[PDB]
Design a protein around this ligand. Sequence first.
Ligand SMILES: [K+]
Ligand SMILES: [K+]
Ligand code: NI
Ligand code: NI
Lengths: 154, 146
Amino acid sequence: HHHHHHTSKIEQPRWASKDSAAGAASTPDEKIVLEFMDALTSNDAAKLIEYFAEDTMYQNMPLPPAYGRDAVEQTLAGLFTVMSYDAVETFHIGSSNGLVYTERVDVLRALPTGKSYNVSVLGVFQLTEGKITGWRDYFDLREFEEAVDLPLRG
Amino acid sequence: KIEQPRWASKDSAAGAASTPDEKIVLEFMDALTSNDAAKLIEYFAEDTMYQNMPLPPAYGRDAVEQTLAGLFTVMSYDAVETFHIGSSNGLVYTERVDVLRALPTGKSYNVSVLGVFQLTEGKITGWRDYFDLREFEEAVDLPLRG
Ligand SMILES: [K+]
Ligand SMILES: [K+]
Ligand code: NI
Ligand code: NI
């Protein structure tokens, strides 16, 4: 057992829009996506899986994809077994052609080591009838694994 | 050739540029395969930035050009397929696959990338690409982060 290490503060990047509504939901899809982002810090796969359609998918791109609502919940619950969201900060959100995009920072804690890290993420959300039919998050896995001593690949 | 993943939107418009910022970004994408930092830097505003996120950022057009030239000394783009392009509030986003070849080993690899571009008056004031560096390094045997 390891004590909970220091949760680093979420800083506003130089390149982040200063006060514009680049961070605000402009469409109903974007508002859903922003609400999903708020739901992440609950660390509850039950709460999260309700946003998804049956025909959906989910992939953290350095890790294997999950296709289908059933595989998505297995993957979400799986990650919540070793990892926990402490904060999600969304700098830029936008949408075209049925896709939402979020440039954000995820503050994660690795349960087994007690350590914490701020992951720079760009993610894309596919919506249909108000439901998430795809979610892909792009980020560097090695820098996260090494910062919190939690290798996830394989 | 690059195969299209099953998760790609089947909306016929999601790959095409919809606004003029997006057309610029798509043309810049096409220009990446020139592997020419001095040519690529033309799309950038004076007050700009650039960061492949697993690597350090480059602030200012001059750093941006030198960072592109440094990368172009060990790798080259062979192809860039953009699956999705979208835009809001002056930022443009691209879900794409970059086929990158490592010059010291000759091996290539298909990198899954989601990029964001900030554009003012058709000038790139920001470019950030998100992707996993280690699987690329391992595939082509070219370390870039220690
Ligand atoms: K917005
Ligand atoms: K489009
Ligand atoms: Ni131990
Ligand atoms: Ni300890």
